[PDB]
Design a protein around this nucleic acid. Sequence first.
DNA 1: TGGTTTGTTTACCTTG
DNA 2: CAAGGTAAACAAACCA
Length: 91
Amino acid sequence: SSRRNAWGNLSYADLITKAIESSAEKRLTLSQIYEWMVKSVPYFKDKGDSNSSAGWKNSIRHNLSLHSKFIRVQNEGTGKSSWWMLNPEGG
DNA sequence: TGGTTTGTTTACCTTG
DNA sequence: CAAGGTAAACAAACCA
Ligand SMILES: [Ca+2]
Ligand SMILES: [Cl-]
């Protein structure tokens, strides 16, 4: 009752923002964001396997695409997925 | 090849 | 209504 969600008061977008800001280069691929969640948010420490992360990972992809505060940056690297970063121009 | 990952959207509930 | 969390439909790109 003192916390919006199980993991705390931060929204998914806030958590993504934190993960990104935590990197020296201020950019992370989707899987690095997943990694950061499982290593940094107590609540997800265990929800990391295949059968249990399906849902929150869906929520993360959803948040990345929906909010303009996050921009997708091309990574050819042949087969590598996009770098996700905070929109310079704000949300 | 066929299953998985990454991304984009739209929909559905619940709160405030 | 708006915001968020959660589901899900779809498809291009990957990859075992
Ligand atoms: Ca976006
Ligand atoms: Cl697409």
